[PDB]
């Protein structure tokens, strides 16, 4: 399973995205969804097809966005080799 995480500068995105920040979030997600990366737990977009070539095609697709370059704070991809859930707090 691969994951993509990303942050946007909010002032810059309001300038350069033609609609706004909440669409800039949605519009980035639209692209990632074209490459099977989908958000299921909030803020992380995961694919589970660990083809590095597919991940690169998506980053490639992502730069096809006019406003992305001037309105992105951070973007990172990585591998989730194993994970576990915590409901021991609800105790």
């Amino acid at each position: 399973m691969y994951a993509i995480a990303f942050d946007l500068v909010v002032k810059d995105t309001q300038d350069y995205h033609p609609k706004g920040v909440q669409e800039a979030y949605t519009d980035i997600g639209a692209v990632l969804a074209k490459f099977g990366f989908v958000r299921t737990q909030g803020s992380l977009y995961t694919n589970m097809n660990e083809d590095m070539a597919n991940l690169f095609q998506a980053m490639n697709a992502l730069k096809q966005l006019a406003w992305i370059s001037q309105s992105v704070r951070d973007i990172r991809a990585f591998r989730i080799e194993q994970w576990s859930d915590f409901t021991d707090f609800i105790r």
Binding site: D7, V9, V10, V21, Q22, Y25, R39, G42, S43
Partner: protein, 66 residues
């Protein structure tokens, strides 16, 4: 305290963030008028898309999302 005077205080549209260490959120419109005096504001967390609910008294003090 008119239900206008309250409502025209919730900055619907502002993108704020819970603290220095909190997540960013977008200010919705009114949810309830609590008798404490302040109001429950509808809110959607920006990066997760979850909708949530928040006291206006807290809201007006968080900073702008950076």
């Amino acid at each position: 305290s008119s239900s206008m005077e309250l409502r025209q205080q919730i900055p619907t549209g502002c993108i704020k963030q819970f603290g220095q260490f909190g997540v960013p959120y977008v200010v919705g419109e009114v949810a309830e008028f609590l008798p404490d005096g302040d109001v429950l504001v509808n809110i959607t967390l920006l990066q997760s898309g979850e909708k949530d609910i928040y006291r206006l008294s807290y809201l007006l003090e968080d900073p702008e999302a950076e």
